[PDB]
From a paper:
The best-characterised SAAT, antigen 43 (Ag43), is a protein that contributes to cell aggregation and biofilm formation in commensal Escherichia coli K-12 as well as in major pathotypes including enterohemorrhagic E. coli (EHEC) and uropathogenic E. coli (UPEC). Ag43 possesses a modular domain organisation that is common throughout the ATs, which encompasses an N-terminal signal sequence that directs the secretion of the protein across the inner membrane, a passenger (α) domain that is responsible for the function of the protein, and a C-terminal translocator (β) domain that facilitates the translocation of the functional α-domain to the cell surface. After translocation, the Ag43 α-domain (α43) is cleaved but remains attached to the cell via non-covalent interactions. Similar to α43a 13, the α-domain of all three Ag43 variants folds into an L-shaped right-handed three-stranded β-helix, with each turn of the β-spine comprising three β-strands linked by loop regions.
Crystals of α43_UTI89 and α43b belong to the C2 and P21221 space groups, respectively, and each contained one molecule per asymmetric unit. Although α43a and α43b are similar in size, the α43b crystallised in this work is truncated and lacks the bottom section of the L-shaped β-helix. The α43b truncation occurred during recombinant protein purification with cleavage occurring at residue 415, possibly by a protease mechanism that remains to be defined. Although Ag43a and Ag43b share 86% sequence identity in their respective α-domains, these proteins differ significantly in their aggregation profiles. Unlike α43a, α43b did not crystallise in its dimeric form. However, given the similarity between α43a and α43b, we superimposed two α43b structures on the α43a–α43a functional dimer13 to infer the potential α43b dimerisation interface, which consisted of two interfaces encompassing a total of 14 hydrogen bonds. To confirm if this interface was indeed responsible for the aggregation phenotype of Ag43b, we mutated residues D29, N60, R62, D79 and S95 to glycine (Ag43bmt) and tested an MS528 strain expressing this mutant protein in aggregation assays. Substitution of these five interface residues completely abolished the ability of Ag43b to mediate cell–cell aggregation compared with Ag43b WT, confirming the predicted mode of self-association. Although α43b–α43b trans-dimers are stabilised by a double-interface, this interface consists of only 14 hydrogen bonds. This reduced bonding network results in Ag43b-expressing cells displaying a reduced aggregation profile comparable to that of Ag43UTI89.
Author numbering: 0 to 356, 361 to 364
């Protein structure tokens, strides 16, 4: 019902916005508490009230609470907005230091959010043409790898740059989205339907879904890059105690498999790269020179072949009915599983020969 304007060059300190009141900020508004403008929710066209930052205006230390809407127009700016309990920031200008404590931030085309902190139950949605940098993601993956929650955390339909994903943090990259230069700690995860470039798994997980593309993922201790059917990973580095898992119909090309790195796949996947014994490939049902250790595993399916597989400590070679593995080299701690109809031959730890055609060593 009531309406106020902060002209350019003027500054207003404090205040509360309730019952659909509106503050039109062309100057500076510091410490406003915004508790109206979003009563009907984000999917309604009939909301009224809230704080509007026009071109050249600025807001500082704003609190957005339940039903509160801070609307930042192109050319407007905010610093250190704290969003709690079902408030939201609609961003078409610039925001710095926004904290989401179960609040929403929507970044529209041309909007830019730097340093947003997504705390528990917070929700950052980046639309096509929107950009965020330096985001800290602390929520959305509380439920672990089995949780398909996408209602909290960071949803990327535009571009996210320099994101840190901490324990419990979840980033989802939709088909049109791009994440560049992401750091993912243990307990954090990133799901790729769009594109990811330069991702560091410092214990965290990256799931590459159908049509997703992950470029230059570095997998350090505890990290996990999973490539589903129809997903693609290019130029992955598997470091010690990291794992690359490529499902049937998934693709990983130009893999750098360093010593102690685990590769987990089957002969129905497509994998190429180099390991500590040179070039290796799993292509069109034929594996050559795969190195399995420290959790690595290769399933050789019916009609498929593997040659020159090194099964070293913590590696597992699993040859199904109708699969063939020749020149298998068994190291100490390596395991071979051969089902009934499997044909397997090689040499073991001892330099001694063996031939099959259930568990070995």
């Amino acid at each position: 019902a009531a309406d106020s304007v902060v002209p350019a060059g003027e500054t207003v300190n404090g205040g509360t916005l309730i019952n659909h009141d509106r503050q039109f900020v062309s100057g500076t508004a510091d410490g406003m508490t915004v508790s109206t403008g979003l009563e009907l929710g984000a999917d309604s066209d009939n909301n009224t009230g809230g704080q509007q930052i026009a071109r050249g205006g600025t807001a500082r230390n704003t609190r957005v609470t339940a039903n509160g809407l801070q609307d930042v127009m192109a050319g407007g700016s905010t610093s250190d907005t704290v969003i709690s309990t079902g408030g939201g920031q609609n961003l078409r200008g610039k925001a710095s230091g926004t904290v989401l404590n179960d609040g929403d931030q929507w970044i529209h085309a041309g909007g830019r959010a730097s340093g947003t902190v997504i705390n528990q139950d917070g929700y950052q949605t980046i639309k096509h043409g929107g950009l965020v940098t330096g985001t800290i993601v602390n929520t959305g993956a509380e439920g672990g790898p089995d949780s398909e929650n996408v209602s909290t955390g960071q949803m990327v339909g535009g571009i996210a740059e320099s994101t840190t994903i901490n324990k419990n943090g979840r980033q989802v990259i939709w088909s049109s989205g791009i994440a560049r230069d992401t750091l993912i700690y243990t307990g954090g995860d990133q799901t790729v339907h769009g594109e990811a470039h330069n991702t560091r798994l410092e214990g965290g997980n990256q799931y590459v879904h159908k049509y997703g593309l992950a470029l230059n993922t570095v997998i350090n201790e505890g990290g996990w890059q999973v490539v589903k059917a129809g997903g693609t990973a290019g130029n992955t580095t598997i470091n010690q105690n990291g794992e690359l898992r490529v499902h049937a119909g998934g693709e990983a090309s130009d893999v750098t498999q360093n010593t102690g790195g685990a590769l987990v796949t089957s002969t129905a996947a497509t994998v190429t790269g180099t390991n500590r014994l040179g070039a290796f490939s799993v292509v069109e049902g034929k594996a050559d020179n795969v190195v399995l250790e420290n959790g690595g595993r290769l399933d050789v399916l019916s009609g498929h072949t593997a040659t020159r597989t090194l099964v070293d400590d913590g590696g597992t070679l699993d040859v199904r009915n109708g699969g063939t593995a020749t020149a298998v080299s068994m190291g100490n701690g390596g395991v071979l599983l051969a089902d009934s109809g499997a044909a397997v031959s090689g040499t073991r730890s001892d330099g001694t020969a063996f031939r099959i055609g259930d568990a070995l060593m």
